[PDB]
Amino acid sequence: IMPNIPQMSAFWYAVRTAVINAASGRQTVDEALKDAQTNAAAEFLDSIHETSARLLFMAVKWAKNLPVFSSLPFRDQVILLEEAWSELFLLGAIQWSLPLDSCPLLAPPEAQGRLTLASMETRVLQETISRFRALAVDPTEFACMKALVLFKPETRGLKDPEHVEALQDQSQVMLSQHSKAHHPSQPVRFGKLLLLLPSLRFITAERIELLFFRKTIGNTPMEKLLSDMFKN
Amino acid sequence: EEGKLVIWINGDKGYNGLAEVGKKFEKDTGIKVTVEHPDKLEEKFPQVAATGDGPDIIFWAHDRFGGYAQSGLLAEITPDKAFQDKLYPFTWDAVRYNGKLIAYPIAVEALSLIYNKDLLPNPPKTWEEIPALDKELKAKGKSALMFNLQEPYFTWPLIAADGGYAFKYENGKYDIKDVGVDNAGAKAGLTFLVDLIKNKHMNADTDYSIAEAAFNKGETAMTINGPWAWSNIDTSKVNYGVTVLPTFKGQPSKPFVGVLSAGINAASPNKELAKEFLENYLLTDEGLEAVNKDKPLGAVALKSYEEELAKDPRIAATMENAQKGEIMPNIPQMSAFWYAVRTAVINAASGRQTVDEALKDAQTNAAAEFLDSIHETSARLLFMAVKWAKNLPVFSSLPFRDQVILLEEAWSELFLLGAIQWSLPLDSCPLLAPPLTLASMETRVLQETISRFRALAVDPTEFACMKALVLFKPETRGLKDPEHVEALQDQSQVMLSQHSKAHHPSQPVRFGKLLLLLPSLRFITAERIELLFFRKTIGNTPMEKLLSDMFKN
């Protein structure tokens, strides 16, 4: 029988990530149930995590508030958001936990109630955040990088890619203009910022869905958010 | 399984005409004969047989029978000298291996000269007289010659004509080291080929489909094709004919001979049954005829029945052309060769380079032992990566462990850059699959990223810098002197823009663009990349293996 309780979600939400990660290779049989054990039990902070939809929703709100975005073909808008949700989410998350010193998912020192992220995940997630913290990555620099990640011309299906190219190039000028103005001392800082972009892909979008988002029937978190924005 | 025999033969063959021969056998021996035509036949066999299962006898091109014999997958057949004489002596040299017969030849095939009797009642005997021949026909709104120039298989006959050859066939076997693609008579035939297009007598863009239609309608006088294209011209009905390929500097054209042979499974308990079936039933006028009926086999390796099909001039031609050709080497080193000539031919033809340079390049590629499979070639891409990294003076000056850590942590990106650069010029090297799945959606992305590097016109100095940007990651965990790494990355960055604004002063954002390619190097995980372009490892990394290999050598 299913316990009629609110704190029982983490049940499968831990096992799922466990059975999938085990049946993948980046985690052996035993190296999986332990995490699920300290995860399932770790109910404390799992509701608010799945409620990291406000972050993604904040990524769409930001984009939709950009006039240059809202001047693209409708489909182009949908396409760019669908293809970049993962990285817009990460950039959001990285900026969220930037001023922090702890988290709702610690892992290696000496993790009660909190989501015990996998090995390579935490290792990379923690590390990538540090790089951003080690730089003075300020609010506008984040806005620029969001833009750089959104306005990808190569993206297939774009009805007006030449224009998406124009906007991305304009974002470089924004980021470079800002970067060099606030840090004349750091000569190669513009690049260093762009060299942070690949880390947004270290962990695939599928895994981002499986780790920080609630179930979504066949559709990506971004699709679900756009769909339920039009049912209205 | 032990008192009956199971056969495997492809669907484009008289597989129903074979069961008519197998049923009579079952009627006179009580030995059940089941004929099967599985899809991945040529690829399934090396699986079921590799261990202990599959058919007793397998039909297929002789070429493939080389890999099998090497893997002890094929039994040594043992025909009497009295039987060996019933088949053309040259056919045996197609099913040989280490001096041991490993299959029974049954049907020969080779490119012939097909022409239109209505338009051209007398085909040229030589190539030299083809140019001035196109002029005459061009007036009456037609064309002289049209054949698929895309595949090296179709253009080799001419290139080989004056001395060209794949691998030297000395004492019973081949010599992978000796390759005759950049010979005297090699540049001779290729040059001539490039001229035909260089004078608008042909098109460097003519493929198979185009040539078939061009001829089958009457828009061309001649073409170069096989016995498979024959019945496809009977759907339409241009009065055609099949004759010997034109000669070059007096020397005949040397097409590739493909022999449909039948080898016996090495793990078959019916080696004598299979043998009896192939010698006293199949390889006989009556035996072969039953299969020819279902679907023609063109010229057959069996004299008796061949001289009965010689009546057909079309077939007579095929056997005639085949005899003047060279047997296709069964060695696995034929993949390297196919790729080299492929590149060389499409190149000189497209003007992407001269004739001599295309052959000089195809020369090494064929003798290259790292072009035989996607794995071997990828292993090479990665080794050049490390070799590259070690050649950087600033690199050797780094804490040994730092060098190891750097290479292991960025092997995927370092390989991808290497593969991408390597495949910028050419249009196909280590990914194409179709003649929906995951390995198909990734291919799309991986070909998409190559387009991006092409559109941006990334030169070697930019690839060198980008590789450095990918190698010198100062955030990598474990590094002993991370500050030095930061400096090197920073330098590479400066050198990269300095070079970018220098070779493209008009594009003020080029630098940014080049760094915006780096993420694509991570779109496909290192794990996947490994399961795609690389071989066996088990809880290891191609770099980790490569480095460990250099440690224990």
Author numbering:
A (entry chain B): 331 to 372, 1215 to 1282, 1289 to 1410
B (entry chain A): 5 to 372, 1215 to 1281, 1293 to 1410
What does the paper say about this structure?
In concert with other transcription factors, NR2E3 has a dual role to consolidate the rod fate of rod precursor cells: NR2E3 is associated with the promoters of both cone-specific genes, including the cone opsin genes, to repress their transcription, and rod-specific genes, including rhodopsin, to activate their transcription. NR2E3-null mutations cause retinal degeneration and lack of color vision in mice, whereas various point mutations have been associated with enhanced S-cone syndrome (ESCS). In this study, we solved the crystal structure of an apo-NR2E3 LBD, which reveals an auto-repressed dimeric conformation that is required for NR2E3 repressor functions.
We thus designed an expression construct of NR2E3(217-410), which lacks the N-terminal region that corresponds to the flexible loop in TR4, as a fusion protein with a non-cleavable N-terminal MBP tag and a C-terminal non-cleavable His6 tag. Each monomer consists of a canonical antiparallel three-layer α-helical sandwich fold comprising 8 alpha helices (H3-5, H7-H10, and AF2), with a disordered region between helix 5 and helix 7. The dimer interface is a parallel coiled-coil formed by the helices 10 of both monomers. Instead, the C-terminal part of helix 10 bends and collapses into the space that corresponds to the ligand binding pocket in other NR. Hydrophobic interactions stabilize the AF2 binding in this position, with residues M400, L403, L404 and M407 in the AF2 helix forming Van-der-Waals interactions with residues from helix 3 and 4. Single mutations of L372 and L375 to arginine reduced NR2E3 repression ability by >50%, and the double mutant L372R/L375R retained only 20-30% of the activity of the wild-type receptor.
